[PDB]
Design a protein around this ligand. Sequence first.
Ligand code: HEM
Ligand code: HEM
Ligand SMILES: Cc1cc(N)nc(CCc2cc(N)cc(CCc3cc(C)cc(N)n3)c2)c1
Ligand SMILES: Cc1cc(N)nc(CCc2cc(N)cc(CCc3cc(C)cc(N)n3)c2)c1
Ligand SMILES: [Cl-]
Ligand SMILES: [Cl-]
Ligand SMILES: [Cl-]
Ligand SMILES: [Cl-]
Ligand SMILES: [Zn+2]
Ligand SMILES: [Zn+2]
Ligand SMILES: [Zn+2]
Lengths: 411, 407
Amino acid sequence: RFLKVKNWETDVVLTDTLHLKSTLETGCTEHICMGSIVLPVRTKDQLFPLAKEFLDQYYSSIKRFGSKAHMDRLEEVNKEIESTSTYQLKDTELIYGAKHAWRNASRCVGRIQWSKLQVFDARDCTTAHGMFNYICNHVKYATNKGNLRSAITIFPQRTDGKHDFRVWNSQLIRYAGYKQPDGSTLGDPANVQFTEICIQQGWKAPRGRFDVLPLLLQANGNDPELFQIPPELVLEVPIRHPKFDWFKDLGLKWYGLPAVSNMLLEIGGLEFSACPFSGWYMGTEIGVRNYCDNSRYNILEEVAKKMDLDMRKTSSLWKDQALVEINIAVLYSFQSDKVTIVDHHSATESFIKHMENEYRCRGGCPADWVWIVPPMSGSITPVFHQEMLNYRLTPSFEYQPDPWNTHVWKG
Amino acid sequence: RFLKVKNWETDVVLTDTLHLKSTLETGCTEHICMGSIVLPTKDQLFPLAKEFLDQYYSSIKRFGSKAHMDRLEEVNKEIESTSTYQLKDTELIYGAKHAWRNASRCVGRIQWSKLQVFDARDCTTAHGMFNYICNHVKYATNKGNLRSAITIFPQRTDGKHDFRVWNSQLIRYAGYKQPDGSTLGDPANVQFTEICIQQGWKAPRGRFDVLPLLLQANGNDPELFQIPPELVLEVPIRHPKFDWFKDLGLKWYGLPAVSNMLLEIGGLEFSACPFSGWYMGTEIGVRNYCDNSRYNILEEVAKKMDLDMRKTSSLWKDQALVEINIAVLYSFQSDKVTIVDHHSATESFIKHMENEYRCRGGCPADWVWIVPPMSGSITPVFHQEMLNYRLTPSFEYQPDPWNTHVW
Ligand code: HEM
Ligand code: HEM
Ligand SMILES: Cc1cc(N)nc(CCc2cc(N)cc(CCc3cc(C)cc(N)n3)c2)c1
Ligand SMILES: Cc1cc(N)nc(CCc2cc(N)cc(CCc3cc(C)cc(N)n3)c2)c1
Ligand SMILES: [Cl-]
Ligand SMILES: [Cl-]
Ligand SMILES: [Cl-]
Ligand SMILES: [Cl-]
Ligand SMILES: [Zn+2]
Ligand SMILES: [Zn+2]
Ligand SMILES: [Zn+2]
């Protein structure tokens, strides 16, 4: 079966066949679409087909499907599963797997870059101190003095589910949030709960607006431990505006390296519960979401006020005007300090090119429109009018519960 | 079988029970989400009729009453004998209001129950259709103080006697391909414009030529009619800060009136059912003016503002976009023509949605269409999870009649 998507701006029609290789579930049924819902120990038995499906894909990609080396590897994995209940990936399979999880990441507009991922294999890691060292190296390598490079660091896989490696931080680098007695928040409200955990664990909180959180690292199912990322490794950019001289006096800065550390990487049935990965920012992630969400730094009012906009009626589009100026400021600051950043026009244009190429060469490109369309100016970017098909290919990145809800403490 | 939606800005969580009444298909499967796709017998009729009449009698607190039973019997009898049935006026008004209520892509539904329904089931000719439409337009326009309305033509019978309004909206501007290679007017209407020329229309060949109505009664060949110009309220577009904005020569019409959809009530199919409300500002300023395949004026506006168009990262497209939208809202307000901005419209919808959750147990909504085409994230709908499903009565797409019609 073939599925058609249409672009309503250009009338270009593409044909998807890759959806036939789809696996997991969307949450949707013929009766209900869950397209806008944010989130809607394995047996030997369920594991070998998963392994096989993965290794069949791996060996096709290297043009060795059905080769002696292919069968030998299937047999080797099969026996290892039977006698040990799990199996180890070759380095080459791991690299390929992490790259494909990104390639398959339907919410990611940045996928044109998928093949250039630097994979750091941390499967020899055994302690939280080991994790900390691996994470510092990742940070330094990815940052590259502002010339950012994609990377992922992969810690040992789940075994019985009692010995998990986890990074408790949702991102490697993020700012503390502190709820005050008066009900206000200092710093980033997204991180209040995790900040409190850190404090409870012994972190001495500076209690400022932009305090870099410490890492909270769990190795081998042990209790997690606190570590400070060396400050010289944390690249940050003061935010200023090219024409508004008062913008700098807002006191804003952001970190250059977005590094997601709470997701789970699934390859060939194996579960990597600590697999921090990083790229670089699209400007609206900072300018629209991090600054302008009401549940975040919430700076729209303060900026529009300084701009002396008419704020008595929403219909002046004062919020829209301020939003734009803030995003201009974020891009200007990054570019001036020579830190890699991408504007939403540029990122979406790239993504459409990526997507068309994927249809030709791969037979599809699963994509979640709700996430792909940028959070401002949606319609004047080339993704808005692009029909997309969302489905789940493995290898993949998945959500997992926050470890503070599931962890068994030892003391 | 009891579904939760979260708002990620407020943490508020809501429970949907209304979806277990969902009926038609989404296009999606367990394996694949088609959420961003724009278009994904007597035996048939009676269950549909019964399903409808049951919800009607439930709504007027009369479920399982004699009058409920007898109506079900009456309709059953009429289907057996006639192969169809006629709605009571009360059923028609409820069906129409509920079709709007159930429109999952419409942000403006807080108004659903105030719809003014014009029953045009006695219409027999295209001239009749024209009279009914002019009346609808004048009533809805109301000298700028817009009121929602629908006008309902006779229902489908055998499918070779369909009433259709061939236009997509009652009021729209002509589209012309020029020897130049380019497009004068609205590129969205190029094809339909040629059908007008082909059927005899004297096109003025301007940028904002209000198209003639092209009407099909009783499955007959369609006919041309021009709406009285004094009934088409238009608004010149100016900016409250930029004096030069007027010289772009821009105007838009005040009345948005979708005329190409099909209204399904209790299995009955109303192929001609133009309905109208009033504009959300972004519809004109973002879509109609700024889509590349529409009036596409972004480049021109940015030039006038003297922005640096050398690189995308100056956000010149975004600056111009905002300004254009400010000017649309300003111009409509100054001429006292109803219009809503996207902040106001989405806040109203969030109020409505919560109302529907507590009183009806749910509100089908399609996030892809509900989130405005600019500044999505700073409106309260962006962070609102929504459930999309099909309830009946409904509005449905139907194919363009020139592909269907035989002469
Ligand atoms: C290199 C430049 C990259 C850019 C510009 C980029 C951009 C984005 C954006 C903008 C989003 C979510 C929409 C939003 O935040 O507004 C996103 C989501 C995501 N990205 Fe990428 N990304 C990049 C690299 C990567 C890498 C290296 C990976 C993994 C190896 C990755 C995996 C993901 C995943 C799994 C999501 C969905 C997250 C979730 O569901 O919460 N991205 N990306
Ligand atoms: C009263 C003011 C109204 C407002 C502000 C409004 C707003 C909107 C908007 C903004 C959209 C599409 C999203 C976009 O254009 O960006 C839409 C779609 C729609 N509206 Fe409403 N509307 C109104 C009245 C009505 C009425 C009176 C009806 C029917 C009685 C209706 C039925 C629909 C339907 C069926 C769609 C989807 C059209 C399609 O799928 O192509 N609306 N509305
Ligand atoms: C590796 C990488 C690089 C890069 N540049 N950006 C990312 C994504 C990071 C991200 C982090 C958070 N906290 C939230 C979102 C979207 C939150 C969201 C989006 C939508 C569309 C709806 C909703 N409710 N929430 C995305 C990853
Ligand atoms: C009665 C009524 C009142 C009112 N104020 N507005 C309307 C909507 C009319 C409308 C007409 C057209 N041609 C296109 C769209 C959206 C086109 C669109 C939206 C999205 C989200 C994606 C896509 N591809 N196309 C909407 C109806
Ligand atoms: Cl972020
Ligand atoms: Cl968000
Ligand atoms: Cl329109
Ligand atoms: Cl559109
Ligand atoms: Zn779906
Ligand atoms: Zn947000
Ligand atoms: Zn558009």
